[PDB]
């Protein structure tokens, strides 16, 4: 009966509500709504073993299980996914599946186990079974129990139940799902089969969401179309497909790109959303902003992109910063000095506009200095076609003079 | 029996966690890939006896075969065997051998973490011990069974009995236990145990083939097919792969997506100098009395006292022996409380103890004491004859250039001065590619000894672009290698040429354009 | 009986264990090979008399055939007759001798570590008693017995009867137990209990053949040959021959790879004494009121004013 409670609860047609409208709160769901993703499936040794699909997570289940994205994006929409098509029931193998736990840990370390949180997120986790019960309702129907746990990076070894049945997850013969970053993959490591990585295809991705989402207006559609083969390189800035939504503010919220759809104006708009997500003083995000736009300096300077995690002058302190900003990250596996890594590589180069802007329109001590001294170490005529047409047209934005 | 039934039910299927099958094989600080499906291959061993003598070669399962309970397990440093006994209890719980299946109990604890009470310690790693199954029912279960109990305890090198003296009896009076148990440890504390336990056996060396089953096991055959040329170049690189840990930094910095061949030899020899600097950071906590660096002063004093008056075996006087002790608990060397009167004391390889000399040589060349820069010059100047040099001296300066760009102007200093030859009837050719020996080659010059003087002279060139292509300080001492080999000849076989001549004549064209002759085959 | 059966089954069964049946021949320092299997000969003894005289060449079975408790048994300095005695124990865990085979109770205690009351000191080095087996149930089983009860007591060289009165009674009085009790030690402290016992005898020499067994037991032919050489040129190694300890040390210095044969006779004996020094470092606690080199200057002294004045025995 505490199942039958369970699953009545966990069908919740509320659960679906996502801020990927935010502003603009389009009526819409974001599966029947919005298109998907895939898997890189990546084996534990260093095989890039598949490219897995959503049913087949379902054919091979993993008992523990790491998957890496963007949190507010594809991985809480994969695990709010499982749950909320866990309310539908058409894959072949559904409606047999027994005790989901949706979970994001960045909220808590409450160093205590489940009634804390189903009692305090969520509505209630019995009180006639007892905590431990309901553990006990965990550890005598283990087989078809599926968990949905977010953000390890934000956790310690604290709450007592959760990180003692992760560090002894045989006790539990369960499925156990994840959602850390890379930035933290190797505490998971240690409690691993194998490794998945969420990646936009965004071959069909951002035409299918600006497909539906703007059928409103198709003409400027057409622009993006034919602008994919005059810009063969259009997958090479489209890098999450959950962060389109300052595209769909800069189509609904801002008709100016409507008659003038280029590049600029577009992700000019991801930075100005990345000002208002996190909307915020001068602390370091605003130096996260400028300090990365320096290691972007440091990107274009040498045109070095995998970094070498040794000159941290640039930005250095505070990483929960700059991946909650996520503007970087790092490596997963072994190197001797581990290696940072970007979103998008030629994205940098535009965080260096900003970088330029930065040390354009600024305090003019030694700041304009550096601009000017870059600015004068690429200083040949024919390299200015090319390199002054990427590097200084995404300087053609941030008008300041 | 229901309790054992349900409990070793639960342990038999208990040891297949992934927490259980990985670890970091290089401690705990850096994510690196551990599997015993892929990872684990099969080592040699050798049965030991009174005499210390590698009796017979035993492979796993015969060491399965050969069981004598207290089974005493040996071997080289930082090591790791806990891959060897987590494959013996996960082969346990995956139906490995016979003999394995035979057993019922089966235990593995790190004695570098073990605390408290037996059944509290083993009840600190399983914590699926109710009430029912009590502390009586747990030790009078374990003595109850008394011959299919197994116990696999690893860790003795930073084990402590105040932590459990229970465990600590479990060791060495076994006659009021009788279950069958399994120590393994190194030669840090050996002489502790030695003689209580039955069984003694050691871990020998890695072969050629089943390191090419590791390295062919964890990377693209791209990094495995031209690291593995650079393995079948190196004759000395062929002897250090005798272990496992070289072959898993070899697997660690090629790993990647790039071919990074500057890691020639010098720096996968500070890769693993620093490395197990890393390790053993806090691991032993360093130098606890007295700092670390004072102690890594100690060991690079021990490679100058040794490799420069030729003295290769360490035993000091008794009492003398603390740094000695500080270095060997840290794991530079390895020692010996073996049978000899005093213990041994020797560096693991002989060319490792030359790259200890030769960082700290150019260790003495880096600081702006002038004391410790001019008797670096005083070592030096223990190279008067060039033949002893290239038989000696050769990986000591090849590695003190290679190490750093500093000690390299000051070999220049010194080796663009010394040309006396010394030793040449005492160092006649052993191998050479010269098969003909003709008279009308004795009609050239009727002294063989200055033939043998050319072969001095350009074996010594070989030292001294092999000196420069190690270095990789490839465009900066150019005036200086230029007026080294002026006045020198260059004797090359055609029919065998590697690419650091091509680095040769690419790097420094002008060291060619300041040579003699080559006698070409 | 069962208590006896059970008990006495598994101490007649764990007499064989390797830290039984192998130790440090030179003290505890030094990793050094034993072995009763092996290192074991056959050594010579003397049945001894009120007139100290060495009437019967005693064997070792000899000895067991001719038992008188309180046994009686002295030796040499620095010998370690715990070989002898856990032979004795070993065989009898192995079926040595029908007079052994007559026996049910064999013990063995290190006198100088020997501490706590009986059933506790012998707790100490069993610890497998458990609270069924009562104390009165031990003492009292062992006077219950009263002919097969046997004890091997070795290393009254440091015994001190505070640590256990009761094993001193069972020393002295021994009418209060009339167990069979054997007690080892040497000529430093014979005379508190030579006139209580029965039985005296004292291990004699070793033979140059039973040397041989032992040189060849335990090392390669080729120093076995060549050291074999040199014993068979000096007629004074071959004096020196009438003692293990220096074919130990012989059989030490030569073990390894080598003809370390710059060992001429003057290094065994800086070996012999040195190594001396070493054992007897801290184990007497070396010159515990007075230091150490003051009484090896007196040694020395006693060595010069001997020898030079022609003087070889020494009555202060």
Same mark, same amino acid.
């Given at each position: 009966?505490?199942?039958?409670?369970?699953?009545?609860?966990?069908?919740?047609?509320?659960?679906?509500?996502?801020?990927?409208?935010?502003?603009?709160?389009?009526?819409?769901?974001?599966?029947?709504?919005?298109?998907?993703?895939?898997?890189?499936?990546?084996?534990?040794?260093?095989?890039?073993?598949?490219?897995?699909?959503?049913?087949?997570?379902?054919?091979?289940?993993?008992?523990?299980?790491?998957?890496?994205?963007?949190?507010?994006? #594809?991985?809480?929409?994969?695990?709010?996914?499982?749950?909320?098509?866990?309310?539908?029931?058409?894959?072949?193998?559904?409606?047999?599946?027994?005790?989901?736990?949706?979970?994001?840990?960045?909220?808590?370390?409450?160093?205590?186990?489940?009634?804390?949180?189903?009692?305090?997120?969520?509505? #209630?986790?019995?009180?006639?079974?007892?905590?431990?019960?309901?553990?006990?309702?965990?550890?005598?129907?283990?087989?078809?129990?599926?968990?949905?746990?977010?953000?390890?990076? #934000?956790?310690?070894?604290?709450?007592?139940?959760?990180?003692?049945?992760?560090?002894?997850?045989?006790?539990?013969?369960?499925?156990?799902?994840?959602?850390?970053?890379?930035?933290?993959?190797?505490?998971?490591?240690?409690?691993?089969?194998?490794?998945?990585?969420?990646?936009?295809?965004?071959?069909?991705?951002?035409?299918?969401?600006?497909?539906?989402?703007?059928?409103?207006?198709?003409?400027?559609?057409?622009?993006?179309?034919?602008?994919?083969?005059?810009?063969?390189?259009?997958?090479?800035?489209?890098?999450?497909?959950?962060?389109?939504?300052?595209?769909?503010?800069?189509?609904?919220?801002?008709?100016?790109?409507?008659?003038?759809?280029?590049?600029?104006?577009?992700?000019?708009?991801?930075?100005?959303?990345?000002?208002?997500?996190?909307?915020?003083?001068?602390?370091?995000?605003?130096?996260?902003?400028?300090?990365? #736009?320096?290691?972007?300096?440091?990107?274009?300077?040498?045109?070095?992109?995998?970094?070498? /995690?040794?000159?941290?002058?640039?930005?250095?302190?505070?990483?929960?910063?700059?991946?909650?900003?996520?503007?970087?990250?790092?490596?997963?596996?072994?190197?001797?000095?581990?290696?940072?890594?970007?979103?998008?590589?030629?994205?940098?180069?535009?965080?260096?506009?900003?970088?330029?802007?930065?040390?354009?329109?600024?305090?003019?001590?030694?700041?304009?200095?550096?601009?000017?001294?870059?600015?004068?170490?690429?200083? /040949?005529?024919?390299?200015?076609?090319?390199?002054?047409?990427?590097?200084?047209?995404?300087?053609?934005?941030?008008?300041?003079? | 029996?229901?309790?054992?039934?349900?409990?070793?039910?639960?342990?038999?299927?208990?040891?297949?966690?992934?927490?259980?099958?990985?670890?970091?094989?290089?401690?705990?600080?850096?994510?690196?890939?551990?599997?015993?499906?892929?990872?684990?291959?099969?080592?040699?061993?050798?049965?030991?006896?009174?005499?210390?003598?590698?009796?017979?070669?035993?492979?796993?399962?015969?060491?399965?075969?050969?069981?004598?309970?207290?089974?005493?397990?040996?071997?080289?440093?930082?090591?790791?065997?806990?891959?060897?006994?987590?494959?013996?209890?996960?082969?346990?719980?995956?139906?490995?051998?016979?003999?394995?299946?035979?057993?019922?109990?089966?235990?593995?604890?790190?004695?570098?973490?073990?605390?408290?009470?037996?059944?509290?310690?083993?009840?600190?790693?399983?914590?699926?011990?109710?009430?029912?199954?009590?502390?009586?029912?747990?030790?009078?279960?374990?003595?109850?069974?008394?011959?299919?109990?197994?116990?696999?305890?690893?860790?003795?090198?930073?084990?402590?009995?105040?932590?459990?003296?229970?465990?600590?009896?479990?060791?060495?009076?076994?006659?009021?236990?009788?279950?069958?148990?399994?120590?393994?440890?190194?030669?840090?504390?050996?002489?502790?145990?030695?003689?209580?336990?039955?069984?003694?056996?050691?871990?020998?060396?890695?072969?050629?083939?089943?390191?090419?089953?590791?390295?062919?096991?964890?990377?693209?055959?791209?990094?495995?097919?031209?690291?593995?040329? %650079?393995?079948?170049?190196?004759?000395?690189?062929?002897?250090?792969?005798?272990?496992?840990?070289?072959?898993?930094?070899?697997?660690?910095?090629?790993?990647?997506?790039?071919?990074?061949?500057?890691?020639?030899?010098?720096?996968?020899?500070?890769?693993?100098?620093?490395?197990?600097?890393?390790?053993? $950071?806090?691991?032993?906590?360093?130098?606890?009395?007295?700092?670390?660096?004072?102690?890594?002063?100690?060991?690079?004093?021990?490679?100058?006292?040794?490799?420069?008056?030729?003295?290769?075996?360490?035993?000091?006087?008794?009492?003398?022996?603390?740094?000695?002790?500080?270095?060997?608990?840290?794991?530079?060397?390895?020692?010996?409380?073996?049978?000899?009167?005093?213990?041994?004391?020797?560096?693991?390889?002989?060319?490792?103890?030359?790259?200890?000399?030769?960082?700290?040589?150019?260790?003495?060349?880096? $600081?702006?004491?002038?004391?410790?820069?001019?008797?670096?010059?005083?070592?030096?100047?223990?190279?008067?004859?060039?033949?002893?040099?290239?038989?000696?001296?050769?990986?000591?300066?090849?590695?003190?250039?290679?190490? $750093?760009?500093?000690?390299?102007?000051?070999?220049?200093?010194?080796?663009?001065?010394?040309?006396?030859?010394?030793?040449?009837?005492?160092?006649?050719?052993?191998?050479?590619?010269?098969?003909?020996?003709?008279?009308? %080659?004795?009609?050239?010059?009727?002294?063989?000894?200055?033939?043998?003087?050319?072969?001095?002279?350009?074996?010594?060139?070989?030292?001294?672009?092999?000196?420069?292509?190690?270095?990789?300080?490839?465009?900066?001492?150019?005036?200086?290698?230029?007026?080294?080999?002026?006045?020198?000849?260059?004797?090359?076989?055609?029919?065998?040429?590697?690419?650091?001549?091509?680095?040769?004549?690419?790097?420094?064209?002008?060291?060619?354009?300041?040579?003699?002759?080559?006698?070409?085959?």
């Amino acid at each position: 009966s505490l199942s039958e409670q369970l699953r009545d609860n966990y069908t919740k047609a509320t659960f679906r509500h996502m801020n990927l409208p935010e502003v603009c709160s389009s009526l819409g769901t974001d599966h029947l709504l919005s298109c998907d993703v895939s898997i890189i499936s990546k084996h534990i040794s260093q095989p890039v073993q598949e490219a897995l699909t959503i049913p087949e997570v379902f054919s091979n289940l993993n008992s523990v299980m790491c998957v890496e994205g963007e949190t507010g994006s #594809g991985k809480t929409t994969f695990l709010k996914r499982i749950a909320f098509l866990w309310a539908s029931g058409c894959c072949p193998l559904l409606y047999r599946f027994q005790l989901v736990f949706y979970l994001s840990l960045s909220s808590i370390t409450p160093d205590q186990g489940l009634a804390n949180i189903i009692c305090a997120q969520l509505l #209630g986790a019995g009180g006639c079974i007892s905590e431990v019960c309901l553990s006990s309702s965990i550890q005598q129907l283990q087989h078809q129990v599926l968990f949905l746990l977010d953000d390890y990076s #934000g956790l310690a070894s604290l709450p007592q139940a959760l990180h003692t049945l992760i560090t002894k997850n045989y006790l539990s013969r369960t499925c156990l799902l994840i959602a850390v970053h890379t930035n933290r993959v190797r505490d998971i490591r240690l409690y691993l089969g194998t490794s998945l990585e969420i990646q936009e295809f965004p071959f069909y991705n951002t035409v299918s969401v600006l497909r539906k989402f703007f059928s409103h207006d198709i003409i400027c559609v057409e622009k993006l179309i034919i602008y994919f083969i005059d810009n063969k390189d259009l997958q090479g800035v489209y890098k999450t497909p959950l962060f389109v939504a300052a595209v769909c503010t800069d189509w609904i919220q801002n008709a100016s790109a409507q008659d003038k759809f280029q590049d600029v104006t577009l992700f000019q708009s991801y930075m100005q959303y990345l000002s208002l997500k996190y909307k915020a003083t001068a602390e370091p995000l605003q130096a996260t902003v400028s300090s990365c #736009g320096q290691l972007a300096l440091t990107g274009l300077f040498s045109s070095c992109f995998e970094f070498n /995690s040794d000159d941290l002058a640039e930005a250095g302190v505070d990483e929960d910063e700059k991946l909650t900003t996520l503007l970087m990250s790092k490596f997963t596996a072994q190197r001797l000095r581990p290696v940072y890594r970007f979103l998008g590589p030629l994205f940098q180069e535009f965080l260096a506009a900003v970088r330029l802007t930065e040390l354009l329109s600024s305090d003019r001590q030694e700041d304009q200095d550096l601009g000017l001294y870059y600015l004068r170490q690429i200083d /040949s005529p024919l390299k200015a076609i090319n390199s002054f047409n990427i590097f200084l047209y995404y300087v053609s934005s941030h008008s300041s003079s | 029996e229901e309790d054992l039934n349900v409990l070793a039910q639960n342990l038999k299927d208990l040891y297949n966690s992934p927490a259980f099958l990985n670890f970091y094989p290089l401690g705990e600080d850096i994510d690196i890939i551990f599997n015993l499906e892929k990872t684990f291959t099969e080592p040699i061993m050798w049965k030991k006896d009174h005499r210390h003598h590698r009796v017979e070669q035993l492979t796993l399962g015969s060491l399965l075969e050969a069981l004598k309970s207290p089974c005493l397990i040996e071997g080289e440093s930082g090591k790791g065997k806990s891959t060897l006994l987590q494959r013996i209890a996960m082969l346990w719980a995956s139906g490995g051998c016979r003999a394995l299946k035979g057993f019922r109990l089966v235990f593995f604890i790190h004695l570098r973490s073990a605390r408290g009470g037996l059944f509290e310690t083993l009840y600190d790693q399983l914590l699926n011990i109710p009430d029912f199954i009590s502390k009586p029912t747990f030790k009078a279960l374990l003595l109850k069974l008394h011959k299919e109990v197994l116990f696999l305890l690893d860790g003795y090198n930073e084990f402590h009995p105040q932590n459990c003296p229970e465990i600590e009896a479990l060791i060495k009076e076994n006659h009021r236990f009788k279950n069958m148990v399994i120590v393994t440890t190194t030669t840090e504390c050996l002489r502790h145990i030695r003689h209580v336990g039955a069984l003694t056996a050691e871990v020998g060396d890695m072969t050629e083939d089943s390191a090419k089953d590791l390295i062919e096991a964890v990377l693209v055959p791209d990094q495995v097919e031209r690291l593995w040329a %650079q393995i079948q170049e190196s004759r000395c690189l062929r002897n250090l792969m005798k272990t496992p840990l070289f072959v898993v930094i070899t697997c660690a910095i090629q790993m990647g997506r790039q071919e990074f061949q500057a890691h020639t030899q010098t720096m996968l020899f500070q890769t693993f100098y620093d490395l197990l600097i890393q390790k053993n $950071s806090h691991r032993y906590r360093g130098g606890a009395s007295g700092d670390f660096a004072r102690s890594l002063d100690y060991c690079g004093d021990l490679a100058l006292e040794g490799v420069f008056a030729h003295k290769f075996d360490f035993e000091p006087e008794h009492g003398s022996s603390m740094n000695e002790d500080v270095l060997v608990t840290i794991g530079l060397l390895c020692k010996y409380t073996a049978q000899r009167l005093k213990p041994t004391y020797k560096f693991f390889h002989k060319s490792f103890q030359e790259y200890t000399a030769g960082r700290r040589l150019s260790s003495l060349l880096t $600081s702006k004491e002038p004391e410790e820069v001019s008797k670096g010059n005083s070592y030096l100047n223990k190279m008067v004859s060039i033949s002893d040099i290239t038989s000696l001296y050769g990986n000591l300066l090849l590695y003190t250039c290679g190490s $750093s760009t500093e000690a390299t102007r000051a070999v220049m200093r010194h080796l663009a001065m010394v040309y006396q030859h010394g030793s040449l009837q005492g160092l006649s050719v052993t191998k050479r590619p010269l098969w003909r020996q003709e008279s009308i %080659q004795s009609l050239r010059n009727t002294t063989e000894q200055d033939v043998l003087k050319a072969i001095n002279v350009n074996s010594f060139v070989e030292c001294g672009i092999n000196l420069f292509s190690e270095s990789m300080s490839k465009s900066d001492l150019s005036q200086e290698f230029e007026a080294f080999f002026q006045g020198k000849s260059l004797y090359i076989n055609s029919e065998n040429i590697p690419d650091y001549l091509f680095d040769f004549f690419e790097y420094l064209p002008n060291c060619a354009s300041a040579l003699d002759f080559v006698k070409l085959d």
